[PDB]
Amino acid sequence: SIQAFTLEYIEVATERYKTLIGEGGFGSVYRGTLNDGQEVAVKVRSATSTQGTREFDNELNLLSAIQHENLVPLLGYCNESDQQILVYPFMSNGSLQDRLYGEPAKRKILDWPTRLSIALGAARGLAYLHTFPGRSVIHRDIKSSNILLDHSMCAKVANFGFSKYASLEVRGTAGYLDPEYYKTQQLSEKSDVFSFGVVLLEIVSGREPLNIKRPRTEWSLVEWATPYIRGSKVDEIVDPGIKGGYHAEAMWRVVEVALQCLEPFSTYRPSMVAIVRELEDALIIENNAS
């Protein structure tokens, strides 16, 4: 069950917050270790994404109830001396972003069967959120750095600081934001589906969504890849490191799904439940490339 921690316990566990992993919605994340030796990621208070005890209480009740094999589980929390802290298990294989085009991608290549299994698991975690009993939970910042990988490379969707049960400002992450958002002023399940479509193109192509260091025609992954997909020239966008390591039909159905996720108008995008079923069939096909 979820554990309450004192601010002192978190101080020892993080060793004076020495080891910083990054910054998120809820705040900065530090690496820690519990008394039982469990490695944890410790997310501490950010001023802009915090209010008080009452607001943190509903967020805490939500995160505790969200349980699924493809979501990072909440292990514990600290609310003491005005510090709001969330404690998650440490995912030792990092993010999908790191494995595609970060530092680990320099040393080793994520093969296509592992990539397809990661897409399916991430889609299953997102579908669980969209069908959460009582009230659908929108992630609202889906992206490849928010898909973490455990020791067996199973995907776990992370980082629900922006999540909420289903004002105009900057939202999402550059490259992933629903193209209708400034016309609707709302993020919905179908906004999450658009962002997941970008993730699928990252998985297929090995490329980040935006890169001004590429030639101008290649600056944007979505805009670059869409004409090849529609022109039955999918091999032109596939990551060179996995060329020849994929079953043709498995790859075609994955990019077909990505293309529907990327539809500019929300009602044409599939549900996450429909995306799971397509990726499941694609994974079967790939496994039968004997």
Residue numbers in the entry: 580 to 745, 754 to 877
Q: Can you quote the paper on this entry?
A:
Symbiosis between legumes and nitrogen-fixing bacteria is dependent on the Symbiosis receptor-like kinase (SYMRK). Nod factors produced by rhizobia are recognized by the LysM receptors NFR1 and NFR5 (2–5) in Lotus japonicus (Lotus), and these receptors subsequently transduce the signal to the malectin-like/leucine-rich repeat receptor kinase SYMRK. SYMRK is the first component of the common symbiotic pathway driving symbiosis with rhizobia, Frankia, and arbuscular mycorrhizal fungi. The SYMRK receptor has an active intracellular kinase domain, and mutations in the core kinase domain have been linked to loss of symbiotic function, showing that kinase activity is important for root nodule formation.
To understand the signaling function of SYMRK in root nodule symbiosis, we expressed, purified, and determined the crystal structure of the core kinase domain. A diffraction dataset extending to 1.95 Å was collected, and the phase problem was solved by molecular replacement using a homology model created from the Arabidopsis thaliana BIK1 kinase structure. The overall crystal structure of the SYMRK kinase domain resembles other eukaryotic kinases of the IRAK4/Pelle-type and A. thaliana BAK1 (16) and BIK1. As predicted from the sequence, SYMRK has all the canonical structural motifs required for ATP binding and catalytic activity. The SYMRK kinase crystallized in an inactive conformation, with a broken catalytic spine (C-spine) due to the lack of a bound nucleotide. However, ATP can easily be docked into its predicted binding site. The regulatory spine (R-spine) is assembled, but the C-helix is in an inactive “out” position, leaving the salt bridge between the catalytic lysine (K622) and αC-glutamate (E638) broken. We mapped the phosphorylation sites onto the structure of SYMRK and used Alphafold2 to model the remaining C-terminal part missing in the crystal structure. The phosphorylation sites are located in three distinct regions, with five in the kinase core domain (S731, S751, S754, T760, and S807), four sites in the border region between the kinase domain and the distal C-terminal tail, which we named the “alpha-I motif” (S877, S885, S889, and S893), and seven sites in the distal C-terminal tail region (S903, T905, S906, S910, T911, S916, and S918). The mechanism of SYMRK activation is possibly trans-autophosphorylation since the alpha-I motif is located within an extended alpha-I helix that sterically would hinder cis-autophosphorylation.
